[PDB]
Every structure is written in structure tokens, then in C-alpha cells.
Amino acid sequence: EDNCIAEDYGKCTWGGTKCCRGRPCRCSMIGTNCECTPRLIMEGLSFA
């Protein structure tokens, strides 16, 4: 009933449901419909 939004672009709601990775959420000029924007990622490359 209040988990965290750990999904890519997971729809959030300025009020409680915050991104699990603590990310800056934003919305439009209506006050509804928000999307978590990724802003971290690791440095270097992937496996191999």
C-alpha cells in the first residue's frame, strides 16, 4: 500500500511513493501523471 517505485519511468506521485533509488520525479503543468527519471547508472561498461 506504499511500496517504492523501483521501475524505469515508474509513475510516481509527489506525496509518498518515491523512487527506490531516490530519484528526482517530475510531472506536467497539471499536478498529476509523474514519471521517475533515471539519473545515476554505473561508470565503465557492462559485464565482459
UniProtKB/Swiss-Prot annotation:
It comes from Agelenopsis aperta. Coiled coil: none annotated. GO terms for molecular function: calcium channel regulator activity; ion channel inhibitor activity; toxin activity. The toxin with D-Ser (named omega-aga IVC) is 80-90 fold more potent than that with L-Ser (omega-aga IVB) against Cav2.1/CACNA1A (P-type) channels in rat cerebellar Purkinje neurons and is more resistant to proteases. The epimerization is done by the venom peptide isomerase heterodimer. Disulfide bonds join 4-20, 12-25, 19-36, 27-34. Belongs to the neurotoxin 02 (plectoxin) family. 03 (omega-agtx) subfamily. This is Omega-agatoxin-Aa4b. The chain holds residues 36 to 83 of 83 of the full protein. The presence of a 'disulfide through disulfide knot' structurally defines this protein as a knottin. It is found in: Secreted. The modification D-serine (Ser) is found at residue 46. GO terms for cellular component: extracellular region; host cell presynaptic membrane. Expressed by the venom gland. Keywords: Calcium channel impairing toxin, D-amino acid, Disulfide bond, Ion channel impairing toxin, Knottin, Neurotoxin, Presynaptic neurotoxin, Secreted, Signal, Toxin, Voltage-gated calcium channel impairing toxin. Antagonist of voltage-gated Cav2.1/CACNA1A (P-type) calcium channels. Paralyzes insect by blocking neuromuscular transmission.
